[model samples]
Target: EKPNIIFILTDDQRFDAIGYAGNKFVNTPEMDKLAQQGTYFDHAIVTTPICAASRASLWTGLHERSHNFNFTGNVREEYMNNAYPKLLKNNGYYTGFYGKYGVRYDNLESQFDEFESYNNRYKDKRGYYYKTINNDTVHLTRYTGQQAIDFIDKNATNTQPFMLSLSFSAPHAEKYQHSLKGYYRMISGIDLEIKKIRDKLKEKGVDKNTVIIVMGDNGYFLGERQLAGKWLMYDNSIRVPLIVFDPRVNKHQDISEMVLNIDVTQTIADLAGVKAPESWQGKSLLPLVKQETSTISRDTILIEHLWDFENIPPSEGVRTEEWKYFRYVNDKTIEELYNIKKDPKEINNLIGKKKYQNVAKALREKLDELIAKNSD
Candidate 1:
């Protein structure tokens, strides 16, 4: 009897946008309760802070450099070969996906028992909220919730375990001119939708046997650094919320170790008693959830947003708990270094100073090494 899994992913959700994360402005009681009841990774980050690339990494357990799925092209075949959803389906789990299948690839239907891709058909598409549900005009958030609940009900009586991946397009602005009131309202809408799913799980008698993982695809910069979207290496563009709730784990835990979005693929495979593919670049997080270790395996990670589009320059960097070093690919000499321990906001740059020159040099070497290592 393997445990059923449900992964709920939101679009462009920031790290501090939830009530559990001390966001007094947003109403996310269900998400807060999920964090309190299970484990919350305080510093979860996406390697690529864009929708297509980050979603590809989440599915393939590889970095954006390895997968290379972004605005330029579709996902590669080798990357999709070991995708967790396809592997789970082959391993006796009924797999289903609904809403915002951001990754572009052929043969996607083969990966899941059920699939429905909708919302934001193109970039900057508006009016996702106005949709027909059961012949009634309902918000996209509410419509996606009903679809997820329907999927759960359809599989509740099945003999095999199920894996449901629900992606919600909410709290992401339709355009650059977003009203703060509208943003908060959309977040509240998502929270209400999650409450419905939780209630349905309990009613279906599978609440105790299912594991729910709630996370965001990437972080958003709502006026931080005068930026309103993702695709940057800053904390406001990469850090997102991650809450894992397993009913089997009775005790609540708060994990402060840095985690990557790629790890979600490995965690899902580990929980399903399946071996992750050899090409996987992420480590399983089960050890942390089981309280077997106090720290993650990787001390530093590469952060990148390589697609040079719409005037956003291509940049890559290396980030650790204590330091950060980044440079634009178009102009290698233009670099920025920050001692994050002292200046978390990254207000000061210490790239070529006498006091922190050694740290900068080491980080520069590390960044070059990662670029060569992950290069195709």
Candidate 2:
């Protein structure tokens, strides 16, 4: 009644930023192949743009406001209990979690049967070189992939289905070399590491029934708006790469429907044949992947960054198929609106324009409604 799940997550990988998504400069054949042969989410988004809140949202299937965790606060024990990993383990799946479990939780180890979670602490370009494998220093990307391969080697023949959450702290440059070339190379190197896991699944004879899900924790701002960080509401900081390669499915398609990192928890639960906890707020994508439906009935989603500081301005916003609206929390009047279809780069601001005031009004209304719904 269950299929093995291999969920690979990366840090700061932006949407459509790989070769598969038409980035001619990057070499990511494995990533491209996964999207080409599986369900490619053209509009995958995170509930929050920052890694701490975004990764927490991914685990709990709740918006940041609901689970209410960020860099400053620890996740509540109750919410972590209901997270996908623990729920999957409770339902008889052997679960293991490896690499960068970024969110702070006192009992995070309880979420998995076997856990190896950490982030490299080196303050140099050696950030990825701090980890070791086979008595030798190894890149964090390969280190994490090696953990998954080792996990599969130990449990592939077990009677219980296993779920492995492999989080690679990669594609996040150390700001060294000051060129996009290094970033693309890191991404390509991650692609090669991913191939090792894919090959292992096939060699173990479990590739047919196993589902591989690839995701990014959050996106980076590679000089967008003259910015290098990811605290703003631009698509560059929030939109991320997402793929679901379920070999059980007979067909593949590029799904333009908007999906979220929050959706991933429910999808995992669904795959395990476990009823998603009533607290979960994400829609499953199995229907779209199986060609049973074309859409998930999603028209709008809330994106926010409530963690605030004088140095780090906060924002909250909503996005529909055609429009994007956001307001700075520090100053309510400081808001931005974009016709995303025409201005996918998000360069134009239509806020306060006569023709778009209604659109702004509607979005503001919907944004508040979502805030209320997601509030704890």
Candidate 3:
């Protein structure tokens, strides 16, 4: 039997915010345990730093430039037809989704066999303090976890494999005047919920064969670079946590591969023994898991955020392990380049520096070539 896949996604969780990642403040024992027992992608990033575009890329295994599902545009039907959830359901897998469907779409109900979407805002007290589940007014994070457990229970005895996507709305602060305290508190609460769901899956007797993939929808900036939210092309806004926990594997591996969020779609399809469509552009991480080392050879990655919203700039860039190049779309000449190895914090801009001019030109051409190739 194929492994039952449970994908847990959190909104606005940073890559280095977990306990296993050496975060001193955040308590994420569940994720930490997964890192200790499974494969952790230390350099995973989102192709786009916004929620809607990144989620669309995740669904289609395509870059945001290819799918073009930003704030102003909708997800193309062809892409939706190839979504991992829909594909798995059509291939004899029971699928369920709960909590914060962040993408904007009209036919969202048609995607999953079981679906529940909730609004998570910080305007009212109920934004974080959500509806009552079993007589207690629980937060959306807890409610989402309970729904996942319930879904596991509902499908415990089923013959076919299952896929459950639990999208948590915690750790993402409210739009304005966001509080770091509230964000950390929400994350701690989510940690407890993860423990509950794991315990329930064990009680249901399917924990051994199940595979759990946990990741952040997009990275968040918590006062790093004087930025608070995502939608920028910085490591703080693009890099996120990715963990692939397969109980069948006996060893824990920390992979240093430069992976994208779009890769999750291909990974899920590959794990289920389903054929991923030709249109998908992302690579599967299953190969990395079988290797003994922590390295995957990936060269350049495109990072973009094209929403023309208020207070956020629209930009696109290319990133390698050692170099970063980006420019605001509205103003092309205003470009920035950083040697990530020397300035991991991105404090230095070396775009037109005489010593690094050739490097900048080469990276610029690489970025343009990637954009043009993907346009096909």
CA lDDT of every candidate: 0.75, 0.75, 0.74
lDDT of 3 by residue, 1-376 (tens): 7988989988888887787778887878888898877888878888888876777777777776677765545556555767888888888788777766555454543223212223464322232212322222445676677767777877444688888887777776533444666776778888787788888888778888888899988888777756677777888888899988888654556555566677789889999999998888787777776563434545355545454556646887788878888778653447889997799888888977799999889888888877766662
Q: Which residue segments of model 1 deviate by more than 4 Å?
A: 110-118, 121-137, 174-178, 294-298, 331-333
What are the models' TM-scores? 0.89, 0.90, 0.89
Which stretch of 10 consecutive residues in model 3 shows the poorest summed lDDT?
127-136
* Alpha-carbon shift of residue 32 in model 2 (angstroms): 0.8
Candidate with maximal lDDT? 1
Q: Tell how far residue 105 is off in model 2, in angstroms.
A: 1.4
Model 2: CA > 4 A from native: 109-118, 122-136, 174-178, 294-296, 301-303
lDDT of 1 by residue, 42-93 (tens): 7888888887788888888888777777563666764586889889889878
lDDT of 1 at 375: 66
Clashes of each: 0, 0, 0
- What C-alpha lDDT, on a 0 to 100 scale, does residue 338 get in candidate 1? 88
- Model 3 per-residue lDDT at 360: 89
What is the alpha-carbon lDDT of model 2 when measured against the actual structure?
0.75
Q: Clash pairs of candidate 1?
A: none
Cα misplacement distance, residue 292 of candidate 1 (Å) = 1.1
Superior candidate under lDDT, 1 versus 3: 1
